[PDB]
Structure 1
Amino acid sequence: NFPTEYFLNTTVRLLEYIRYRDSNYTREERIENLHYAYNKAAHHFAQPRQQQLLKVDPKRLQASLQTIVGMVVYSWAKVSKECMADLSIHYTYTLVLDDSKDDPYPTMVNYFDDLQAGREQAHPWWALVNEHFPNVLRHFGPFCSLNLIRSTLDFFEGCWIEQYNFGGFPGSHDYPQFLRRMNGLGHCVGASLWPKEQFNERSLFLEITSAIAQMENWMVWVNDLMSFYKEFDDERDQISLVKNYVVSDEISLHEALEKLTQDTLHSSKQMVAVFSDKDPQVMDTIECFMHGYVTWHLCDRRFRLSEIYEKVKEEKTEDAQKFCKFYEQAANVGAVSPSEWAYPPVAQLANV
């Protein structure tokens, strides 16, 4: 049974400590970027090649795409429309894999030789991601690029490990976070925040590196907390930082949630301490990302947090009320109807 009571307690503390407040866009801008990113991505995923090598159920691709276009647009508020679109494609390729069930082993036997030789990878996912990667990379300098490349490779290994539905040997205190960094795309996300068009990678090398290092944790932990609801009675998940803290450190689900919350509140505290007296343009990007990322969690269908707002809409219990106020705050800014941007469906473009 889902610990609704604690779920509220934990989420509320987080939203209050960070003083959640999304002011990233005017409703017209939001809609304008959502459509742009979706349109370029939709046309991309509708091509016969992408349609045939990417093994995904149409209704699932469509949902994944709209979920990512939101994530990108809602959290990368300061980058260009082109950048948002190209990033939306990359992170859609990753989300599709994130929910998948496949054995990479057979198609990874000649990974390095094919890579070094320039031959197309045998694993369809890599074939599509690597072929499209330059469209994402043209937006960044060499350092950030390397970070995106590494993180995507890490993420791939992370989905691989998860295929074994293994949560760690009891007593393996390092396994939980080892896996979370693997599947976190932390460095990919943190480095994709600095397009060379807006930032000089050599002038801000230290601030960017720091942002990557620190934002990696804040970023993953926030999702571990916000996405705790959709992940639970879900088979594909189960193997999560929270539930692995349970199996590996042999503690109660209750203690795992509290542990995660303290890490996050701490990660949040230091984000502020370090990036307050720094380059304004840098702070702005971090700020927009942090608040926007939270708005996306409270709004997007993938996380089904409305199924908790409705089942807690009543009953006054301090947390329950504080949660619904936040849920509404975000709902008022990012609860944009799909029919206003996510059109036409990918399936329709594919069969044109």
Structure 2
Amino acid sequence: FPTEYFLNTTVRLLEYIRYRDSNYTREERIENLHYAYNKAAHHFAQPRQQQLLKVDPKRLQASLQTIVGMVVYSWAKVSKECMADLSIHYTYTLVLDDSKDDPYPTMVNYFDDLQAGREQAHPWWALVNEHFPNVLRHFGPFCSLNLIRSTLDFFEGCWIEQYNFGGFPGSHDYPQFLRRMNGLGHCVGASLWPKEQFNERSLFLEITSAIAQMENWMVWVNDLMSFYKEFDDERDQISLVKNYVVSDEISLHEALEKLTQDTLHSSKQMVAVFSDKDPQVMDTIECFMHGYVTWHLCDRRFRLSEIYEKVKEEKTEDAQKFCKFYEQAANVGAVSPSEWAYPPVAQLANV
């Protein structure tokens, strides 16, 4: 693991994007964290959900928390209810993103069942489509469509990932094709615009553009920050960076530089395009980026903590410019789960 080269880039992106979540107080975050968590936990604890969603209780609990965090810290300008509902949806998606089961047998009649109104055979679809309306009520038709599509894309993405395939050497189009499939880009980007706060028809071009640009910023920033936790990992192995290596036949270092250039560039352009656009829009966008990074740095899932401390023992300036940031975030978003994530889902389920 190029812990070395790891420092190098993360610092660039952070310094160039200039990570700094100012707006949004700790009391406010906690208030939201608990609202979302609470509604989601009660949801996932219902018997139906409990029996159709096959997940180890502890992974569910962990996933839920990582997601409530992500939504609350990035969808900073939406209502509490919207955060809660988005938290449920993104929790369903994450539970699948880490799973393993062939969907072939349950997808054989997908379309006929869909058109007929019969409950899907794949349990996941049964639960997600049943819950979906609670997510969709927060948006206009256009945005809704994007959510529906991206979630469908995501299902296929997980399907493909089950083959643990990084692409045929020479298949340069494979990597990004896959990252987009399992990235939920359009889902994320469109869910940033609740109809209660934005007029889908008045800001159509703004919203469309944001969906298109955010799709890449969002996934590439995650590929970058995750360049730690995913690796000697099992469900990983097939990451955008690792697929670049396999498919583009280049070194891990070269793929790394690539991701970085795309990321930095994507970042530069997000600003260039939205700075002068509608203020409300620029705020939702800026608040998302800062929150998204805050979440990456704060959530243990990405073990970003180490690469701060364990690089705190060595002055390489590239490992010190990194640390100037981490804390900068942990002091805003570092919150003990005992302050919001309670009681555990399992406890509500057996009640």
> 1:24 offset after TM fit, Å?
3.3
Can you list the C-alpha shifts for 1:97-120, whole angstroms capped at 9, x where unaligned? 111111111100000000000000
The count of residues paired between Structure 1 and Structure 2 equals 351
Q: SS of the counterpart of 2:219?
A: helix
> 1:325 offset after TM fit, Å?
1.6
> 1:312 offset after TM fit, Å?
1.2
Can you list the C-alpha shifts for 1:127-176, whole angstroms capped at 9, x where unaligned? 00000000000000000000000000001100100000100000000000
Task: State the alpha-carbon separation in 2 of the partners of residues 23 and 149 from structure 1.
Answer: 33
Can you list the C-alpha shifts for 1:246-299, whole angstroms capped at 9, x where unaligned? 000000000000000000110011111100110000000000000000000011
TM-score by length of 1: 0.99
Can you list the C-alpha shifts for 1:181-226, whole angstroms capped at 9, x where unaligned? 0001000000000000000000000000000001100110000000
Kept in 2: contact 1:295–1:334 (CA 8 A): yes
Task: State the alpha-carbon separation in 1 of the partners of residues 300 and 50 from structure 2.
Answer: 24
Residue 17 of structure 2 corresponds to 18
Kept in 2: contact 1:24–1:77 (CA 8 A): no
Task: State the alpha-carbon separation in 1 of the partners of residues 137 and 229 from structure 2.
Answer: 35
Task: State the alpha-carbon separation in 2 of the partners of residues 235 and 125 from structure 1.
Answer: 22
Residue 166 of structure 1 corresponds to 165
Task: State the alpha-carbon separation in 2 of the partners of residues 24 and 190 from structure 1.
Answer: 21
Task: State the alpha-carbon separation in 1 of the partners of residues 162 and 312 from structure 2.
Answer: 37
Aligned-residue CA RMSD (Å): 0.6
Can you list the C-alpha shifts for 1:298-321, whole angstroms capped at 9, x where unaligned? 111221212322321211001100
Q: SS of the counterpart of 2:322?
A: helix
Residue 319 of structure 2 corresponds to 320
Q: SS of the counterpart of 1:62?
A: helix
> 1:228 offset after TM fit, Å?
1.1
Task: State the alpha-carbon separation in 2 of the partners of residues 304 and 5 from structure 1.
Answer: 15
Task: State the alpha-carbon separation in 2 of the partners of residues 40 and 162 from structure 1.
Answer: 31
TM-score by length of 2: 0.99
Task: State the alpha-carbon separation in 2 of the partners of residues 194 and 238 from structure 1.
Answer: 34
Task: State the alpha-carbon separation in 1 of the partners of residues 302 and 314 from structure 2.
Answer: 22
Q: SS of the counterpart of 2:238?
A: coil
Residue 335 of structure 1 pairs with residue 319 of structure 2: no
Runs of 4+ in 1 over 6 A off after TM superposition: none
Task: State the alpha-carbon separation in 2 of the partners of residues 183 and 304 from structure 1.
Answer: 22
Task: State the alpha-carbon separation in 2 of the partners of residues 73 and 190 from structure 1.
Answer: 15
Residue 135 of structure 1 corresponds to 134
Can you list the C-alpha shifts for 1:17-60, whole angstroms capped at 9, x where unaligned? 01100113111001000000000000000000000000000010
Q: SS of the counterpart of 2:269?
A: helix
Structure 1 unaligned segments of length 5 or more: list them: none
> 1:7 offset after TM fit, Å?
0.8
Task: State the alpha-carbon separation in 2 of the partners of residues 351 and 48 from structure 1.
Answer: 9
Kept in 2: contact 1:24–1:292 (CA 8 A): no
Task: State the alpha-carbon separation in 2 of the partners of residues 4 and 145 from structure 1.
Answer: 41
Task: State the alpha-carbon separation in 2 of the partners of residues 311 and 58 from structure 1.
Answer: 32
Residue 277 of structure 2 corresponds to 278
Task: State the alpha-carbon separation in 2 of the partners of residues 228 and 16 from structure 1.
Answer: 17
Q: SS of the counterpart of 1:321?
A: coil
